[PDB]
């Protein structure tokens, strides 16, 4: 019966906001796109403008090549049949070369070479996007927290696709490009290394993924509960603490016995999120290269009855 | 009668769109059921009559 | 009895009642079709030897 502030009840539109021109080449920035009332019911209605620099276009074209390579392989697997393509869309897979090729690049296209091509494209796209996040932060004079938070996820991705295959000595260890295919790869990876549940770093990574869900629920709910005091304007609460920040702090102080500040809760948030992929990459790197049976390792380290 | 009062409460536009979706779903379902029964698949029946397959 | 339209909003009750009517009716029709004693098309096909 009361307004929960989940959806805006009255939308307001003014002149298009071009943004802050700190050091941004206004040539690279595109024009403001359309206004989406559907998106405006939940957040901002404005689309664009989007910046397109050197790294932006490099990453966009490299990612387009990766996506197109996978899609053309999928069309080949369908026998160029659109009905088959739609029927088996989730069952298609661009697989890495068989283990007998090792890390060599001399695998046939149908048996792993096209996977290497798509992998190179993806590698370029992701690293150019990382540089792009760093440079976009730099142009506006902001800190580089987004770049390092992205670097954590990039490290999990690199361990999965690049570093662990090299350590294990074959491209066959890497992840195929496919919807159900990479799910099968995940399940098989767990089975081969003996119940990845007993990997300590898989356990910590899950602790932090659960903790990210918990913490974003807590933080979103807290900010919505104090939005009646302008609590969603967190930067001004950092600069000039209002009653929203105090009420949020006191809620969690009286509930848990300790609280955060408007600025430090975001340190909690960023670390809780990055630890997911950081710990996960460590665990995946250890799997196979150091421990090949995590249940037996568990038994030898407590964690499981002998 | 006095049925036009039904337009004094419900938005005409969404009524018409919902009616169109409902009618299309029903017609498609009825035709598909007729196809499912081999004794009313007019393509199959015509193939049997004209010795097509 | 007449107060049901006061507590309950007409649109929700009308739409839900009609939706339930349609789904229950089509379920009854499906059940009748499924068993071989109320599938009228099969009865007609066997009757006219068009099967």
């Amino acid at each position: 019966a009361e307004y929960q502030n989940i959806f805006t009840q009255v939308q307001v539109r003014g002149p298009a906001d071009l943004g802050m021109t700190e050091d941004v080449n206004l040539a690279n920035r595109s024009g403001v796109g359309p206004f989406s009332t559907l998106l405006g019911w939940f957040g901002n209605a404005q689309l664009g403008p989007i910046y397109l620099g050197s790294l932006g276009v490099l990453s966009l074209f490299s990612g387009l090549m990766w996506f197109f390579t996978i899609g053309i392989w999928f069309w080949y697997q369908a026998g160029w049949n659109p009905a088959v393509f739609l029927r088996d869309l989730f069952f298609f897979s661009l697989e890495p070369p068989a283990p007998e090729y090792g890390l060599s690049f001399a695998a046939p296209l149908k048996e792993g070479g096209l996977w290497l091509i798509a992998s190179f494209f993806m590698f370029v796209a992701v690293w150019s996007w990382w540089g792009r996040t760093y440079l976009r932060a730099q142009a506006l004079g902001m800190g580089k927290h987004t770049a390092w938070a992205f670097l954590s996820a990039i490290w999990l991705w690199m361990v999965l696709g690049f570093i662990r295959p090299i350590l294990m000595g074959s491209w066959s260890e890497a992840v195929p490009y496919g919807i159900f295919s990479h799910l099968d790869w995940t399940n098989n990876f767990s089975l081969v290394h003996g119940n990845l549940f007993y990997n300590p770093f898989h356990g910590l990574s899950i602790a932090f993924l659960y903790g990210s869900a918990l913490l974003f629920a807590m933080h979103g709910a807290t900010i919505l509960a104090v939005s009646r005091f302008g609590g969603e304007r967190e930067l001004e609460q950092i600069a000039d603490r209002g009653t929203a920040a105090e009420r949020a702090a006191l809620f969690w102080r009286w509930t848990m016995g300790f609280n955060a500040t408007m600025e430090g809760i975001h340190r909690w948030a960023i670390w809780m999120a990055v630890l997911v992929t950081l710990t996960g990459g460590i665990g995946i790197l250890l799997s196979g290269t150091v421990v090949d049976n995590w249940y037996v390792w568990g038994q030898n380290h407590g964690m499981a009855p002998l | 009668s006095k049925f036009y009062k039904i337009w004094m409460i419900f938005d005409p536009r969404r009524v018409f769109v919902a009616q169109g979706v409902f009618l299309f779903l029903l017609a498609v379902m009825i035709h598909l059921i007729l196809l499912s029964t081999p004794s009313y698949n007019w393509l199959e029946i015509s193939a049997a009559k004209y010795n097509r397959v | 009895f007449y107060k049901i339209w006061m507590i309950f909003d007409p649109r929700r009750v009308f739409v839900a009642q009609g939706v339930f009517l349609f789904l229950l009716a089509v379920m009854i029709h499906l059940i009748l079709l499924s068993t071989p004693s109320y599938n009228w098309l099969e009865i007609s096909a066997a009757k006219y030897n068009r099967v």
Binding site: W41 | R14, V17, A18 | R11, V15
Partner: peptide
């Protein structure tokens, strides 16, 4: 949208 939320296409259009 929640007022017309009591399939989805009816509210969608």
């Amino acid at each position: 949208f929640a007022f017309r939320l009591m399939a989805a296409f009816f509210a969608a259009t």
